Amino acid sequence: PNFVGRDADGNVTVDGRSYPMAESVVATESTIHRSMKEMAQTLANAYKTLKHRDTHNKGNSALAPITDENPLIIISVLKGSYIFTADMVRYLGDCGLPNVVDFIRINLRFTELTGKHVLIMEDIADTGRTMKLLVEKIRREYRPASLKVCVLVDKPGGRVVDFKPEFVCLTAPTRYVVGYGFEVNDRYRNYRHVFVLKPEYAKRYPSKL
Amino acid sequence: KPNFVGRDADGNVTVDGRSYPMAESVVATESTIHRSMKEMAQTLANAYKTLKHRDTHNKGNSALAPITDENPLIIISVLKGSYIFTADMVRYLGDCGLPNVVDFIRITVLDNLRFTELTGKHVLIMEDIADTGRTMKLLVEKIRREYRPASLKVCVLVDKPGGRVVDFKPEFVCLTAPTRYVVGYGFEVNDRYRNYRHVFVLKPEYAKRYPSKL
Ligand SMILES: Nc1nc2c(ncn2CCN(/C=C/P(=O)(O)O)CCOCP(=O)(O)O)c(=O)[nH]1
Numbered sequence: 001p002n003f004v005g006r007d008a009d010g011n012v013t014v015d016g017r018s019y020p021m022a023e024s025v026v027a028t029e030s031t032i033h034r035s036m037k038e039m040a041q042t043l044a045n046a047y048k049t050l051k052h053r054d055t056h057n058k059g060n061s062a063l064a065p066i067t068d069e070n071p072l073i074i075i076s077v078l079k080g081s082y083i084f085t086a087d088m089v090r091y092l093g094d095c096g097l098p099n100v101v102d103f104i105r106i107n108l109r110f111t112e113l114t115g116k117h118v119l120i121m122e123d124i125a126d127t128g129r130t131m132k133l134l135v136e137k138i139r140r141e142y143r144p145a146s147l148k149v150c151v152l153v154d155k156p157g158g159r160v161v162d163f164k165p166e167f168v169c170l171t172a173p174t175r176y177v178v179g180y181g182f183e184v185n186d187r188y189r190n191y192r193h194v195f196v197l198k199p200e201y202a203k204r205y206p207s208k209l
Numbered sequence: 210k211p212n213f214v215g216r217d218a219d220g221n222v223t224v225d226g227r228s229y230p231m232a233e234s235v236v237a238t239e240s241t242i243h244r245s246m247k248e249m250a251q252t253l254a255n256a257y258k259t260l261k262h263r264d265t266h267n268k269g270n271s272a273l274a275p276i277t278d279e280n281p282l283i284i285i286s287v288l289k290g291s292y293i294f295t296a297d298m299v300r301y302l303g304d305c306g307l308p309n310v311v312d313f314i315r316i317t318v319l320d321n322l323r324f325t326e327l328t329g330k331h332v333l334i335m336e337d338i339a340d341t342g343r344t345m346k347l348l349v350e351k352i353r354r355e356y357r358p359a360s361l362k363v364c365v366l367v368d369k370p371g372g373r374v375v376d377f378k379p380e381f382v383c384l385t386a387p388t389r390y391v392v393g394y395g396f397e398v399n400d401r402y403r404n405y406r407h408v409f410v411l412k413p414e415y416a417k418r419y420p421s422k423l
């Protein structure tokens with residue numbers, strides 16, 4: 001468990017390291033990983049028994065269980081979800097749920113999604129527009145057996161369209177957060193904890209990368 | 210967390226009691242992997258923390274700038290096999306206090322970089338493995354020609370030097386592997402086993418186990 005405090009200048013510290021950009025801590029690494037570990041069991045319990053189209057043996061007409069032959073299809077949204085997805089699939093492996101990951105940037109190279117169980121792994125749902133558009137696009141272009149969304153952070157106070165993620169690790173207020181995949185022009189993406197950003201830092205790096 | 214390698218009643222390799230029927234042997238357990246990544250982050254921090262490169266945060270500045278959050282180390286992560294490696298390493302680099310930003314490239318070039326200001330920057334390629342050396346040889350040449358960065362270096366999780374058909378030497382290597390096909394921790398066969406925490410040598414009987422297109 002990480003120790004959260006304040007340094008001599010009032011900056012947020014976690015495990016003795018100062019974070020001058022942070023207004024406060026939303027969730028430390030150990031809290032995030034506990035939430036994701038429980039979510040991995042939640043995802044395993046929801047999918048381990050399901051069956052979907054057999055593409056390993058196309059000669060088999062029946063529905064096949066979720067195995068290494070026909071794993072769960074996971075769509076990971078770059079770039080904000082790559083660190084979240086990296087830890088989740090390993091926790092899913094701990095829970096014995098076979099899965100494969102392809103990436104989308106808002107494109108995939110997976111093509112046999114029809115009749116499959118597909119799970120989207122996204123960093124955050126705020127207004128809901130990003131995932132509302134993605135689910136509609138995947139459903140119309142692939143028609144999976146099922147399509148669900150797992151987000152690391154949900155902001156239900158920001159929802160302005162009709163979208164609700166089925167699986168949520170953390171619930172946050174309508175504040176701009178950084179760390180553990182979240183960033184300000186890619187800065188702070190590699191931090192192990194999620195912080196509320198100081199508004200003074202929101203426009204700190206305006207130059208294009 | 211020290212891992213225990215053994216065999217089950219059927220003769221399959223086990224790591225911490227979990228059976229891996231696809232594995233012929235263990236190249237490196239999770240603790241071995243993360244120990245080398247922790248030491249590599251220190252090596253990378255020491256090699257870059259005092260260097261300077263072009264200031265693109267303040268375009269009105271003419272002097273070279275240190276590596277800061279304003280002008281961080283540019284990391285190019287090669288999809289897909291390097292994404293788990295990259296996710297762990299950049300967090301270890303944060304532990305070492307090395308500011309960095311990550312963009313992704315996919316090559317067979319399928320997905321291009323979105324970063325555009327690499328000229329005169331220190332750029333670090335993060336790749337999962339170097340086998341024949343071709344993929345990285347071509348990628349080093351393309352980035353050098355297209356951008357001319359201040360420095361361009363390659364950090365691989367696994368080096369297989371016994372497989373070289375071209376002359377390529379990555380500057381930083383976490384682990385060395387025998388000239389075998391490995392799976393686990395980013396490495397896969399048709400995307401299977403990518404999420405395993407240990408690197409195994411795959412059994413030859415599993416080489417073409419999943420031929421169907423995903
Ligand atoms: N770092 C951070 N980003 C947030 C946050 N909320 C939304 N977003 C936007 C997340 N994403 C922006 C990343 P980009 O590739 O465009 O730079 C867009 C996804 O937004 C979620 P939604 O469509 O509003 O539900 C937040 O709290 N912290």
Ligand SMILES: Nc1nc2c(ncn2CCN(/C=C/P(=O)(O)O)CCOCP(=O)(O)O)c(=O)[nH]1
Nearest residue numbers: 289290339340341342343344389390391396397
């Ligand atoms: N799973 C596995 N793949 C190997 C191996 N060696 C090369 N490769 C090819 C890896 N790469 C593609 C697989 P990924 O999904 O990571 O993008 C190709 C890069 O090959 C390295 P090189 O050009 O031969 O030096 C190996 O031992 N195990």
Ligand SMILES: [Mg+2]
Nearest residue numbers: 078079080183
């Ligand atoms: Mg992002």
Ligand SMILES: [Mg+2]
Nearest residue numbers: 183184185186
């Ligand atoms: Mg952003």
Ligand SMILES: [Mg+2]
Nearest residue numbers: 287290337338
């Ligand atoms: Mg590769």
Ligand SMILES: [Mg+2]
Nearest residue numbers: 188278308309
């Ligand atoms: Mg930093």
